[PDB]
Structure 1
Amino acid sequence: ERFPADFVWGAATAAYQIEGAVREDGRGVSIWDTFSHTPGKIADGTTGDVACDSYHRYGEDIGLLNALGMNAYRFSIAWPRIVPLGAGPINQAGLDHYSRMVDALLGAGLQPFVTLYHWDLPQPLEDRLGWGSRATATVFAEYADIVVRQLGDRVTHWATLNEPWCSAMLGYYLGVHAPGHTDLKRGLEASHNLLLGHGLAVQAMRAAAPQPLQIGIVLNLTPTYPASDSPEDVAAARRFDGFVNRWFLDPLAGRGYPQDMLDYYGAAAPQANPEDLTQIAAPLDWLGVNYYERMRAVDAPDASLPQAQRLDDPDLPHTADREVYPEGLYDILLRLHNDYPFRPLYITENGCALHDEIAEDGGIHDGQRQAFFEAHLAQLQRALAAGVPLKGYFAWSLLDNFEWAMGLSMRYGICYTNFETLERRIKDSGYWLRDFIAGQ
């Protein structure tokens, strides 16, 4: 029934999804500025130019966090505000902005959990191949050093990357996210340079920090289940598990890349010399899990890689964009606890999108989202009872925002954002979380 007294309770955002102010105070161009301004890439014709205007309205965001009784806020720093050319001089005005924001959070009793990279690569670096180039890993580590030197007196909890599988595979192989390339080899090379950037940044951050830091990385993990026990379906489930989960977990754990996936990828696999793998496995203080969905896999040999397709279950609840499977959160946490070395663990994102509207009474009656949270929180209690060292939970998202290729049309907030007036309003699920946390 009861969570630990010192459990972290938060909500999460990312800079490009909320900030707006894309040209203000020296900000450079990111790959997502380029991509969202390319005709046809965003489903509803919107961009992040304004978004939630949180660059100016972060005080309102803090008011919401306080109204919800949270004790932490997960947000990202925009690399284009700090080093507008990607590699080059710093923009002190960008650092000063986040320094003021951090002081405002600490003044309100909210612990900042900062993500350094949440997908907004400076465009000048993409012009030089972006994550397809090892040089980008080096300059990412330089950016991490700069930020820690100025904010690390107040921020202890840092993550290097958010969801490298998305940046690599959606951005460079499937072409649905920025920068929008469609080449498997480039996607796998990007996955390696992301991991190398992470490892180089961890070392740089520890050397630059004015106090001991707690450094992690944030991964999306998808528990995978075969649709049947046939050799074909079990193999498809292992391939999908390797493609999303083990490709990242194993090198971070010091186990190299998974051999079964190297064999499957063949000539497309990156050249991973052992020096790189040692750097990638730099010791971490925590691991962040982003959990949304499971994969029930059936073999699909004529499909594209990894030749596994999803078998939908019409009996389970569905949101605006996903299938709901709360028990997968327990499963993946138990797997991490038993099979991998990372601890403690945080749930750095969990949430859902619905077709929310303001009702006649002025509230947002998002009962499915309340049920979503209740069901996932129950699974966390089960995981804690099994001994999983879980230390906090962050709802995605604090407020409705720019949901990447879906634009403003996919609402994940616990607070509703009116994108015309920029007013925020707490949804019923947000009041449920407030009252649940208060009872803890």
Structure 2
Amino acid sequence: MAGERFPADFVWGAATAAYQIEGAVREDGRGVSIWDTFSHTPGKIADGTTGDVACDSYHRYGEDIGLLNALGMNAYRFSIAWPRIVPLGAGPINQAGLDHYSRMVDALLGAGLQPFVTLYHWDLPQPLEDRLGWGSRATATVFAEYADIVVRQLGDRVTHWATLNEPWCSAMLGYYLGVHAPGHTDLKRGLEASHNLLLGHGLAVQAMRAAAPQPLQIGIVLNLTPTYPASDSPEDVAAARRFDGFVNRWFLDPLAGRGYPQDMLDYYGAAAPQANPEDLTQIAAPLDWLGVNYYERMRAVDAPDASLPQAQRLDDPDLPHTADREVYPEGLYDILLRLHNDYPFRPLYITENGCALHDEIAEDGGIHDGQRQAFFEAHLAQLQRALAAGVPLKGYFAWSLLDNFEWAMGLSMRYGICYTNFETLERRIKDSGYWLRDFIAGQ
């Protein structure tokens, strides 16, 4: 009921992050990141792996370009590693680092692949974490200095930039739940980190506008989880609102000029961050787009005896599941309709969508990942519905181009549209990747 075609100028890409794919962790002046420290801490990664080699994309990005070209994509979302650019976090530049990314940008543009660059995809320089990391306002200031450096050199060629990827993860997984680097476990520290991440975003936007050699299209990338109460009871509805506030509105509202949501301030009490009119104005620095990373919904039941927020997930077993998630494509439509009608950000990009499976190389040599094909098919159908409703959607990036180091899950959780043999570093396009190729060409 939503037609057949996407816009002719739609952006079609795949996405990666530097620590997940690059390897070469000590090469060419790179400094230590929090993810180097964390992955080298016994027990923090499920399978004893690290990003030391990963996909070896520091050396093999040309192979990655070959895959993007084989897929007929027109864009590549990737991150720049702050440790390669400013190894001390705050300090001199490492021109060799910048020059690596300059050559990669030129290779992408030569191939007809628009670079969509993420400045911060979780790889904070360890020296900054030694000075409290996102627990310090200074980290926000020097993040903006890094953003300036990078834009000054690459902004003649790269128009589309994101400051941060998934600040909820960096703050809440990294400083509250301890599952991500740097691995702290305190709610107040997580909420403080969340504020300094938003402040760093806003300071960076302003620094990038001043350093820009041409006008830029600057955004931020948020994970969003559409949340639904398991019943209409006051208790379940309130649990859904608390979860929705914890993940989504805590970030969307300040970005939208609305301040932090008061219901969440009330809930968090004394753990809430120190945070004034001046910082809010900074946080709301005008953006040219918003990136949405969408994977799943949350169907919330009140659970008065759990950690902040007392919201238990109610699984639907009749819905399919992947290796690690429930599949719910209609949530993509729902979150986009909400953003379109309720929030000011536009245009919108889906900067990540994808799934993990127990992928293996079959006897014939292919990877028969039909559930991942079906995942893309169903989510793209929802995007057509969103477009029909007027949502100002301008592109879609599959997470991920290739299997990679999936954070606390290690190399063991495969999200690629291309398979990565981590021993030999060979990549092979999965059946879902060929489906994407053919879908994109058919448009």
Distance 1:402 1:169 in 2: 20
Q: Deviations over 1:90-148 (max 9, x none)?
A: 00000000000000000000000000000000000000000000000000000000000
Distance 2:46 2:241 in 1: 32
Distance 1:329 1:279 in 2: 29
| 1:429 Cα deviation from its structure 2 partner | 0.2
| 1:80 Cα deviation from its structure 2 partner | 0.1
Distance 1:304 1:134 in 2: 27
| 1:264 Cα deviation from its structure 2 partner | 0.3
Q: Secondary structure at the match of 2:395?
A: strand
Residue matched to 2:334: 331
Distance 1:89 1:57 in 2: 27
User: What RMSD, in angstroms, separates the aligned Cα atoms of the two structures?
Assistant: 0.3
| 1:350 Cα deviation from its structure 2 partner | 0.0
Q: Secondary structure at the match of 1:114?
A: strand
Distance 1:209 1:304 in 2: 43
Residue matched to 2:408: 405
2:143 is the alignment partner of 1:140: yes
- Which stretches of structure 1, 4 residues or longer, exceed 2 Å deviation after superposition? none
| 1:65 Cα deviation from its structure 2 partner | 0.2
**How many pairs does the alignment contain?**
440
1:154-303 equivalence runs, <5 A: 154-303=157-306
| 1:338 Cα deviation from its structure 2 partner | 0.1
Q: Secondary structure at the match of 1:265?
A: helix
Distance 2:306 2:264 in 1: 17
| 1:85 Cα deviation from its structure 2 partner | 0.2
| 1:181 Cα deviation from its structure 2 partner | 0.2
Q: Secondary structure at the match of 2:207?
A: helix
| 1:304 Cα deviation from its structure 2 partner | 1.1
Distance 2:288 2:397 in 1: 18
Distance 2:54 2:264 in 1: 39
Residue matched to 2:8: 5
Q: Secondary structure at the match of 2:218?
A: strand
Distance 1:379 1:61 in 2: 28
Q: Secondary structure at the match of 1:179?
A: coil
Q: Deviations over 1:215-265 (max 9, x none)?
A: 000000000000000000000000000000000000000000000000000
Q: Secondary structure at the match of 1:257?
A: coil
Distance 1:219 1:27 in 2: 27
Distance 1:268 1:436 in 2: 48
Residue matched to 1:357: 360
| 1:321 Cα deviation from its structure 2 partner | 0.3
2:155 is the alignment partner of 1:152: yes
Q: Secondary structure at the match of 2:76?
A: strand
Identity %: 100
Unaligned runs of 5+ in 1: none
| 1:272 Cα deviation from its structure 2 partner | 1.0
Q: Secondary structure at the match of 1:172?
A: helix
Distance 1:307 1:301 in 2: 5
Residue matched to 1:366: 369
Distance 1:338 1:212 in 2: 27
Distance 1:397 1:75 in 2: 10
Distance 1:152 1:325 in 2: 37
Distance 1:194 1:143 in 2: 14
| 1:202 Cα deviation from its structure 2 partner | 0.1
Q: Secondary structure at the match of 1:217?
A: strand
| 1:295 Cα deviation from its structure 2 partner | 0.1
| 1:386 Cα deviation from its structure 2 partner | 0.3
Distance 1:304 1:153 in 2: 47
Distance 1:271 1:57 in 2: 44
| 1:320 Cα deviation from its structure 2 partner | 0.3
Distance 2:416 2:271 in 1: 38
Q: Deviations over 1:386-424 (max 9, x none)?
A: 000000000000000000000000000000000000000
Q: Deviations over 1:309-357 (max 9, x none)?
A: 1001110000000000000000000000000000000000000000000
TM-score of the pair, normalised by structure 1: 1.00
| 1:360 Cα deviation from its structure 2 partner | 0.4
Distance 1:367 1:341 in 2: 37
Residue matched to 1:41: 44
Q: Deviations over 1:40-85 (max 9, x none)?
A: 1000000000000000000000000000000000000000000000
Q: Secondary structure at the match of 1:115?
A: strand
Question: Alignment partner for residue 315 of structure 2, among 312, 316, 338?
Answer: 312
Distance 1:185 1:377 in 2: 39
| 1:271 Cα deviation from its structure 2 partner | 1.2
2:407 is the alignment partner of 1:376: no
Distance 1:53 1:410 in 2: 17
Q: Deviations over 1:366-385 (max 9, x none)?
A: 00000000000000000000
Distance 1:309 1:283 in 2: 36
Distance 1:161 1:187 in 2: 16
Q: Secondary structure at the match of 1:413?
A: coil
TM-score of the pair, normalised by structure 2: 0.99
| 1:86 Cα deviation from its structure 2 partner | 0.1
2:24 is the alignment partner of 1:50: no
Residue matched to 1:17: 20
Unaligned runs of 5+ in 2: none
Distance 1:342 1:424 in 2: 37
Distance 2:193 2:76 in 1: 29
Q: Deviations over 1:6-40 (max 9, x none)?
A: 00000000000000000000000000000000001
